[PDB]
């Protein structure tokens, strides 16, 4: 039995080996307790404000919308300590590990953003941190690997399966299957087995809460739509949550279209995959015809999770949220546009959200619309990728 519903409609659940069920039940209890504990909430708020820098700015971008009827704000998760929204929820989960009496952290990472986020939270809070990373990601993300090691974390390359993110996800679960009495598994997105999709949403929901307050203050009304990129779903559900009951507010999630949906080289399972069961949940996923799990392709390494959180699949099924895709080339035009016209270098992940807002504007430039893009991170990490594309293209 559980305290909370492990499903969002038919999506979600707890598809872990039996041995891990007491670990999920323990975590769910500790979370429900923490959410009622004003000492826990105060400690979390203190870390978010004085260590991470919350609240984050809401920036009105005038140059990029000039001569249209679109008003565009960017919620600046790029300004959070660590340079991405991931920092919010790792601080909450590290506090949950402490609450349960654990002093060790296990984390998975693909391109390394969540590994770095886990390592910083662990360094701050005095927790011993070990991070699993597919050997192919290790080889291509030396900067993030070195950041994790500077912060005192152990980075363990994973050589099994495809040696990428899904294989690190398995390895973290394997370890936790034996170590959960002393270690907490700090899952990096709003996916996996219950209670993680719920915990990660609640520890990211300050994004949407602040956005609502900031847009009431600046515009005197709610946005027409809030727009976020979707890897596993954490930044998007963090932006969406506080607006779900505001039925006039559009919720738009943007999956990576990669080389184009029709090529099969993409990362858009919610709209172009097939429901399956993997990583502890029933959810849309990238898989072969006979049920083997596949990689998510995108120009943006941070959009590599090969499935999507179950709350997104549910919000889609009921028509509360709408999901779209943006290709590598659209993302890369949005990246260049924000740099040149606003002086902000966006993460290539976030550039997918911005590319979709730019399309909403350009397609219907006389439509009055008040839009917020969740700028989930900064793009310093991406300037080599972008340089190399532009060079190979002859720009």
């Amino acid at each position: 039995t559980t305290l909370l519903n492990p499903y969002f409609g038919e999506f979600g659940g707890m598809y872990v080996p039996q041995i891990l069920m007491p670990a999920l039940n323990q975590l769910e209890e500790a979370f429900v307790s923490a959410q009622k504990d004003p000492e826990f909430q105060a400690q979390f708020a203190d870390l978010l404000k004085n260590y991470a820098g919350r609240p984050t700015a809401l920036t009105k971008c005038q140059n990029i919308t000039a001569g249209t009827r679109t008003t565009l704000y960017l919620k600046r998760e790029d300004l959070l300590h660590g340079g991405a929204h991931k920092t919010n929820q790792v601080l909450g989960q590290a506090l949950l590990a402490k609450r349960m009496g654990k002093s060790e952290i296990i984390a998975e990472t693909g391109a390394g953003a969540h590994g770095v986020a886990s390592a910083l939270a662990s360094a701050l809070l005095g927790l011993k941190c070990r991070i699993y990373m597919g050997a192919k990601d290790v080889e291509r993300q030396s900067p993030n690997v070195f950041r994790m090691r500077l912060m005192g974390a152990e980075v363990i390359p994973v050589h099994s399966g495809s040696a990428t993110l899904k294989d690190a996800c398995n390895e973290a679960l394997r370890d936790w299957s034996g170590s959960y009495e002393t270690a907490h598994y700090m899952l990096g997105t709003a996916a996996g087995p219950h209670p993680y999709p719920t915990i990660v949403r609640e520890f990211q929901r300050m994004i949407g809460e602040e956005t609502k307050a900031q847009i009431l203050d600046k515009e005197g009304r709610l946005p027409d739509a809030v727009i976020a990129c979707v890897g596993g779903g954490s930044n998007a559900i963090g932006m969406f949550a506080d607006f779900i009951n505001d039925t006039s507010v559009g919720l738009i999630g943007v999956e990576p279209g990669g080389h184009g949906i029709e090529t099969g080289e993409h990362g858009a399972p919610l709209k172009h995959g097939r429901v399956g069961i993997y990583f502890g949940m029933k959810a849309p996923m990238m898989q072969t015809a006979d049920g083997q799990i596949e990689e998510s392709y995108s120009i943006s390494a941070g959009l590599d999770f090969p499935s999507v959180g179950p709350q997104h699949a549910y919000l889609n099924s009921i028509g509360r949220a709408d999901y779209v895709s943006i290709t590598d080339d659209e993302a890369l035009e949005a990246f260049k546009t924000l740099c040149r016209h606003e002086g902000i270098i966006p993460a290539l992940e976030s550039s997918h959200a911005l590319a979709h807002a730019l399309k909403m504007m350009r397609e219907q430039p006389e439509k009055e619309q008040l839009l917020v893009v969740n700028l989930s991170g900064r793009g310093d990490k991406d300037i080599f990728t972008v340089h190399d594309i532009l060079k190979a293209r002859g720009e």
Binding site: I19, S160, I277, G280, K282, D290, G291
Partner: protein
């Protein structure tokens, strides 16, 4: 499931435990895997546990992770595994054949259709490693509709409610986990299981097979002495495959020697 009922009744008459090896289907190729499996049977296996290669075997340690990888290197698919299973049953009338599955391979083309195919090829049980009792309903229901035993895991710290659920829902055998963690011969269980064994019998559970970290004759005899109906060994068997890839004849010789020794340990 009836094949397990008959096997355990016969073993009880022979005052004998069951010895049950695990291998990955198609490791290191289809033809060699078929010969491996016939060798395990000829050498004394009472039942088989057979894994379908899956991209994400999250209850398995490195030995079996690598077996999955070898089968994939040989192009092994679930369809080819079902062809293998039909052939294995066509050769061997009474040996219980259990599959070790991950949920996505069962759900992929419909849970009911999966169990219907198992019944068609003559499989006797299915253990879905990433489906806990809480999520088991559509799996156990489909299993029973198609005369397949759903195999439930009893962890070494199972409380009374869990014991009662596994006892009620399971058929064929109860999987008695040696320890926490994942498959592997490098980690032996150190917890006494005889209390769990006794409670499972009290609740009329399917007979218990101890599994995880069983790699030696003395562990097979210990499982029987503790009151279990037998023991499962995976990694130790797969190790022999991995060690002997370059020599299929030496591989079969070593598999035969190991299985013979392990089976001998169950009689006494």
């Amino acid at each position: 499931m009836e094949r397990y009922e008959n096997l355990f009744a016969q073993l009880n008459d022979r005052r004998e435990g069951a010895f049950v090896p695990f291998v990955t289907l198609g490791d290191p190729g289809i033809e060699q895997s078929l010969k491996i499996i016939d060798t395990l049977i000829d050498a004394g296996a009472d039942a088989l546990e057979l894994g379908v290669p899956f991209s994400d075997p999250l209850a398995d340690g490195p030995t079996i992770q690598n077996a999955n990888l070898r089968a994939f290197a040989a192009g092994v698919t679930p369809a080819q595994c079902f062809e293998m299973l039909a052939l294995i049953r066509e050769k061997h009338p009474t040996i219980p054949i259990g599959l070790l599955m991950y949920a996505n391979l069962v759900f992929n083309n419909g849970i009911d259709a999966f169990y219907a195919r198992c019944e068609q090829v003559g499989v006797d049980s299915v253990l879905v490693a990433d489906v806990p009792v809480e999520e088991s309903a559509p799996f156990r229901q489909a299993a029973l509709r198609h005369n397949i035993a759903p195999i439930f895991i009893c962890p070494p710290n199972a409380d009374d409610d869990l014991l009662r659920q596994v006892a009620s829902y399971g058929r064929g055998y109860t999987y008695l986990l040696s320890r926490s963690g994942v498959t592997g011969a490098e980690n032996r269980g150190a917890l006494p299981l005889h209390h769990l064994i006794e409670k499972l019998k009290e609740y009329h559970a399917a007979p218990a097979l101890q599994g995880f970290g069983i790699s030696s004759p003395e562990q097979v005899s210990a499982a029987v002495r503790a009151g279990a109906a037998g023991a499962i060994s995976g990694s130790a068997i797969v190790k022999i495959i991995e060690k002997n890839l370059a020599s299929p004849k030496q591989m079969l010789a070593e598999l035969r020697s190991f299985v013979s020794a392990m089976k001998a340990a169950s009689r006494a």
